[PDB]
Structure formats: structure tokens, C-alpha cells
Ligand binder design. Structure first.
Ligand SMILES: O=C1COc2cc(C(=O)N[C@H]3c4cccc(O)c4C[C@H]3C(=O)O)ccc2N1
Length: 167
């Protein structure tokens, strides 16, 4: 038993809710919150910008030190950093960004990072301002992640559509 509330059970291991991930992180304080990162860990907009703002820019400060030491991530890759005031850890995962011209096939590799954590609060990867089909992202999530994932979807009308179209 965990502390996530009002999530709709989609599969054995995948749950979904229409909610602001920042709020959900603030309320649950999960072991792991997933950030929709880019390879530079430049948290400007979307999930990344919203989480970083909620940390008072501490996420960005930590991230800049990470990049200065290690260089950029790979598309499809991830790193574990602090969750600051939102979670114990933040798993920064780089889904392919369609609007930047990156290969959507890399979405499965991105979701594989979730399997290294038993439970996660996460966004649907590559959706929103990343430019991919969210119905597609949810399908890849369900077909790739085997650990317990609680998906917070910001957009109400997208949420209604993801549930109604889920196979
Ligand atoms: O306070 C605030 C205001 O800014 C926010 C923006 C988002 C957001 O852009 N979400 C979408 C997005 C964007 C880029 C990449 C992604 O994988 C996703 C998932 C998708 C969604 O879940 O709808 C979410 C929360 C907040 N919170």
C-alpha cells in the first residue's frame, strides 16, 4: 500500500490521474518524481520548468553542476539527482523531443529507465511541448514499464481522451 490518491488503475502496474505533477509531488513526497528533462538539464518549460520553479531554482543549480562534471545526457537516458522539496529523488529522463527532430523510437528506451525504481510519480514522456502523440506515449509506457508508475496528466481534456481511448 502507498499514499497516491484517486489514480485510475489502467493495468497491473500503471495508474493515471488528471493532476499537476508539482502538486502531487508536494502532497505525496514520493521516493521518485520523474522530470521530463532535456540532455542539457535546462529546465525551462513544461514539467521541467514547473518542477524547477517549485524548487526555487535549486533543481537548476544542482543540474548545472551535474552537467559541468558529466556532460550532457543521451536522448533516451536519465540521471538520478535530488528531489529537493518535492521528492526524495528526481529521475531526470530525456524522452525524444519531436519538435527538435529527434527519433520517436527512442521513447521506449526512455521509459526503460523507470524500471530501475520500484515506484514513481511521473509524466507521460515525449508528450506536451515534446511533440509526440500522448496516446502513443501512454501505450509505450504500459508496454515498457514493469514497476509501479503513477502518471499525473496536467491537461484535463487530454486526460479524458487518454482514458477513453485506452486499450
Ligand atoms: O504549475 C504548473 C504549470 O506548468 C506545468 C506544465 C506541465 C506540462 O507541460 N505537462 C505536459 C508536458 C510538457 C512537456 C513534457 C511532458 O512530458 C509533458 C506532459 C504533459 C502533461 O502532463 O499534460 C505540467 C505541470 C505544470 N505545472
Amino acid at each position: 500500500v502507498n499514499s497516491f490518491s484517486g489514480y485510475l488503475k489502467l493495468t497491473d502496474n500503471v495508474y493515471i490521474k488528471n493532476a499537476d505533477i508539482v502538486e502531487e509531488a508536494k502532497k505525496v513526497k514520493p521516493t521518485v518524481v520523474v522530470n521530463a528533462a532535456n540532455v542539457y538539464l535546462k529546465h525551462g518549460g513544461g514539467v521541467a520548468g514547473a518542477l524547477n520553479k517549485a524548487t526555487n531554482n535549486a533543481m537548476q543549480v544542482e543540474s548545472d553542476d551535474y552537467i559541468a562534471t558529466n556532460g550532457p545526457l543521451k536522448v533516451g537516458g536519465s540521471c538520478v539527482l535530488s528531489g529537493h522539496n518535492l521528492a526524495k529523488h528526481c529521475l531526470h529522463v530525456v524522452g525524444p523531443n519531436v519538435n527538435k527532430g529527434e527519433d520517436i523510437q527512442l521513447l521506449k528506451s526512455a521509459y526503460e529507465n523507470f524500471n530501475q525504481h520500484e515506484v514513481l510519480l511521473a509524466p507521460l514522456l515525449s508528450a506536451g511541448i515534446f511533440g509526440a502523440d500522448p496516446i502513443h506515449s501512454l501505450r509505450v509506457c504500459v508496454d515498457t514499464v514493469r514497476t509501479n508508475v503513477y502518471l499525473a496528466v496536467f491537461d484535463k481534456n487530454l486526460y479524458d481522451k487518454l482514458v477513453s481511448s485506452f486499450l
